[PDB]
Amino acid sequence: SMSVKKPKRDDSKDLALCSMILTEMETHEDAWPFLLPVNLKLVPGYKKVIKKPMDFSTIREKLSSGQYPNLETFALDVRLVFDNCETFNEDDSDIGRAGHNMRKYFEKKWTDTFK
């Protein structure tokens, strides 16, 4: 509350450290369904169903231009990628599987870097 603060967590490396996690997600072999925005002209259903499209290249541009206010907002957009994937793709499909793999991959790196 006013003039009463928990001790200050060092957040000065968060930008850099999110950038690293993102490079690792970009270079994973199962990243291909998530590297670019889904083409809304060419994928029937996507535009109406997926209220908030997200992908790695949009996260990268947001990160590079100071549109993430803190590390939690960055994690929300990475998880939105995978939530979107699960909404639109059967679990037993190459894309369905890639999404589960990438989310496991992300969550581990997140815990090891920040928790």
UniProtKB/Swiss-Prot annotation:
Family: Belongs to the WAL family.
Name used for this protein in its record: Bromodomain adjacent to zinc finger domain protein 2B
Subcellular location: Nucleus
Tissue spec: Expressed at varying levels in several tissues, whereas a smaller transcript was expressed specifically in testis.
Lineage: Eukaryota, Metazoa, Chordata, Craniata, Vertebrata
Start and end residues of each Bromo domain: 9-113
Originating species: Homo sapiens (Human)
Role summary: Regulatory subunit of the ATP-dependent BRF-1 and BRF-5 ISWI chromatin remodeling complexes, which form ordered nucleosome arrays on chromatin and facilitate access to DNA during DNA-templated processes such as DNA replication, transcription, and repair. Both complexes regulate the spacing of nucleosomes along the chromatin and have the ability to slide mononucleosomes to the center of a DNA template. The BRF-1 ISWI chromatin remodeling complex has a lower ATP hydrolysis rate than the BRF-5 ISWI chromatin remodeling complex.
Subunit note: Component of the BRF-1 ISWI chromatin remodeling complex, at least composed of SMARCA1 and BAZ2B, which regulates the spacing of histone octamers on the DNA template to facilitate access to DNA. Within the BRF-1 ISWI chromatin remodeling complex interacts with SMARCA1; the interaction is direct. Component of the BRF-5 ISWI chromatin remodeling complex, at least composed of SMARCA5/SNF2H and BAZ2B, which regulates the spacing of histone octamers on the DNA template to facilitate access to DNA.
Domain of life, per lineage: Eukaryota
